[PDB]
Amino acid sequence: KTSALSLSNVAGVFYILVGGLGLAMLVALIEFCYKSRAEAKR
């Protein structure tokens, strides 16, 4: 019959999304650690 989508059938796109958000925060923090350390020298 005509079945409705379940979270199992789409959870894959949910793991990439959360992975992207974690990666984006990591990228932002790394640029923060670089500028913060550089500012101390200057």
Partner 1 sequence: IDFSKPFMSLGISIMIKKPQKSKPGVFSFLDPLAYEIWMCIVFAYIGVS
Ligand X SMILES: CCCCCCCCCCCCCCCC(=O)O
Chain residues that interact with ligand X, rule: CB under 6 A: 15-16, 19-20, 22-23, 25-26, 29-30, 33, 36-37
Question: Is position 5 an interface residue for partner 1 (rule: CB under 8 A)?
Answer: yes
Q: Which two tokens stand for residue 34?
A: 């670089």
Task: Give the Cα separation of 42 and 14 in Å (integer).
Answer: 43
What residues have CB less than 8 Å from 7, skipping those under 6 apart?
A: 14
Q: Which of residues 9-38 bind partner 1 (CB under 8 A)?
A: 10, 14, 17-18, 21
Output 1 or 15, the one with its CB closest to ligand X: 15
